Amino acid sequence: VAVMTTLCDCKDKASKKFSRFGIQPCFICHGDAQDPVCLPCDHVYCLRCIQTWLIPGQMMCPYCLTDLPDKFSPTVSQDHRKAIEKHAQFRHMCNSFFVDLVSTMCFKDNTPPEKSVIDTLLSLLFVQKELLHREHTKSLSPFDDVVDQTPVIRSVLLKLLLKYSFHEVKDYIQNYLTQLEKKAFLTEDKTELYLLFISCLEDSVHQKTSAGCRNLEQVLREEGHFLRTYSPGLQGQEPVRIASVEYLQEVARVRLCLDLAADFLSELQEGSELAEDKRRFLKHVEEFCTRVNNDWHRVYLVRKLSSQRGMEFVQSFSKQGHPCQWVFPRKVIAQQKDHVSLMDRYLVHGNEYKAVRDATAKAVLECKTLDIGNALMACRSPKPQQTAYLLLALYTEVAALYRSPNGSLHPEAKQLEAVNKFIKESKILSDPNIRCFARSLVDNTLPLLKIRSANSILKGTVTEMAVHVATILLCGHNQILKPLRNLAFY
Ligand SMILES: [Zn+2]
């Protein structure tokens, strides 16, 4: 309190000495002014505020109620601007010093500070009702002359308050939550605030676990014990408003547990047996997933699995009898076929490769080949990128046909003659380089499909990247691509 009053009256005296006894911002916007205008009552208001408020029949002062004689004509471009800049520099220095002081002195060790200090820290953030919007939130400003015209919630105070153990900081954050939901965030999208809180708690628990000196087995034992003794207690904080801190801690803990579990599942998929102890953790995860029906946890698990590894990971993971099926719901496995196809990632260009690839697919299933020509003739992005899309569509169609065993060697079933006639007729790709590339591609003699990769997972991605960079080089008549062309082809 003593140092806070020292900072406050130091700022007051500094401003008084700097700019002639008390520069004050605009009373309407309550923030630092742009293009300052000086009233006869030694008042500084914003140009926009004064132009939007002094136009009607209220030629007076919102602060001290003094009549304005003529107009807001006198503006000071010499003293007010420099004084405002100096006071802003001092206020930013004070804010940075205050945040550094609270970060260092208030959390030196594992002992929390007193109570009134935390209460004043969480109470100074507001600009509570003044006679005139009301009750804005600040970016840790010990002063009252800085606001924003929107209630904004940060997380620096919350994060710095979660550094200690969660057992002794629940009431303070609970009071802060009740304040925010009672005064600024009564009825709105509370999902954003809930996810902000849960992410802050994930960060805090990650800091606590990583910074500590403990082996992984102790944490695994505690996690398994919690999983095996977790009473649901879900219905307590569900319906519309109630969200206890304990519930948030529990869901954060299960988030961390399933994050690690997905990491371990990916590691098992890319590796050998799991040392007979990680298997117990995965079995506990499976029993937890099959015991509770809150399928959001498995949704998050598969989302994290896709983020770490990719869509192809779950695509191969969703087969028909692999001993890892508990990560799917009872409905996804029910109506999923064995004909899951690869992904047409070349849609980056936008609404042009899709049409040509659909035309190529229709020409593949049928015998007519005029559809791809019609699709090519009805689009922008001329000849270079046009032929790029055409040949990429042909490659992806032939790859989809070959990789799937049911329709292997499909073009050889009276369809390669159609594509050969299409190449012969249309002159859009009747260039020797494109012609020989297509001749290699159609009969699958290109030396890229036979990558002989034992993993057979990323080999499709590798071939896709190789053929895509080859297409970019072939269709790119650019000076920057000449060395790459020479490296790839000569
Ligand atoms: Zn203003």
Per-residue three-class SS string for the chain: CHHHHHHHHHHHHHHHHHCCCCCCCCCCCCCCCCCCEECCCCCEECHHHHHHHCCCCCCCCCCCCCCCCCCCCCCCCCCHHHHHHHHHHHHHHHHHHHHHHHHHHCCCCCCCCCHHHHHHHHHCCECCCCCCCCCCECCCCCCCCCCCCCCCCCCHHHHHHCCCCHHHCHHHHHHHHHHHHHHCCCCCCHHHHHHHHHHHHHHHHHHHHHHCCCCHHHHHHHHHHHHHCCCCCHHHHCCCCCCCHHHHHHHHHHHHHHHHHHHHHHHHHCCCCCCCCHHHHHHHHHHHHHHCCCCHHHHHHHHHHHHHCCHHHHHHHCCCCCCCHHHCCCCCCCCCCCCCCCCCHHHHCCCCHHHHHHHHHHHHHCCCCHHHHHHHHCCCCCHHHHHHHHHHHHHHHHHHHHHCHHHCCCCCCCCHHHHHHHHHHCCCCCCHHHHHHHHHHHCCCCCCCCCCCCCCCCHHHHHHHHHHHHHHHHHCCCHHHHHHHHHHHC
Q: Ramachandran region of residue 404, left (φ > 0), alpha (ψ -120 to 50) or beta?
A: beta
Is 136 annotated to bind a ligand? Reply is: no
436 is in an annotated binding site: no
> Residue 188 C-alpha to ligand 1 middle, in angstroms?
28
Distance 192 CA to ligand 1 centre (A): 30
The alpha carbon of 64 and the centre of ligand 1 are apart by a number of angstroms equal to 16
Q: Cα(32) to centroid of ligand 1, in Å?
A: 7
Residue (of 249, 120, 245) closest to 178 by Cα position: 245
Calculate how far, in angstroms, residue 155's C-alpha sits from the geometric centre of ligand 1: 27
DSSP bridge pairs for 126? 137
Q: Please state the φ and ψ torsions of residue 350, each to the nearest 5 degrees.
A: 100, 105
The reply, when asked if residue 46 is annotated as ligand binding, is yes
Q: Fill in the amino acid letter for 43.
A: H
Structure-solving method: cryo-EM
Contact status, residue 285 vs residue 257, Cβ threshold 8 Å: yes
Q: Is 61 annotated as a binding residue?
A: yes
Span from the CA of 478 to the centroid of ligand 1 (angstroms): 54
374 Cα: distance to centroid of ligand 1 (angstroms): 61
Q: 210: CA distance to ligand 1 center in Å?
A: 47
Distance 47 CA to ligand 1 centre (A): 7
How far, in Å, is the centroid of ligand 1 from the Cα of 80?
14
The rounded Å distance from CA 40 to ligand 1 centre is 17
Question: Is 64 marked within a binding site?
Answer: yes
Resolution in angstroms for this experimental structure? Answer: 3.8
Gap between the Cα atoms of 143 and 12, Å rounded: 10
- Start-to-end Cα distance in the chain: 76
Please enumerate in sequence order all residues whose Cβ is within 8 A of that of 142, keeping only pairs 6 or more positions apart, or say none: 4, 7, 8, 11, 94, 95, 98, 124
For residue 9, which amino acid is it? D
Distance 25 CA to ligand 1 centre (A): 7
324 is in an annotated binding site: no
90 CA from centroid of ligand 1 (Å): 20
Q: Is 289 annotated as a binding residue?
A: no
Looking up tokens 């791809």 gives 372
What distance in angstroms lies between residue 157's CA and the mean position of ligand 1's atoms? Answer: 28
24 alpha carbon to ligand 1 midpoint, in Å? 10
Distance from the alpha carbon of residue 181 to the mean position of ligand 1, in angstroms: 28
Residue 390 near residue 356, CB atoms below 8 Å: yes
CA–CA separation, 351 and 362 (whole Å): 17
Residues in the chain: 490
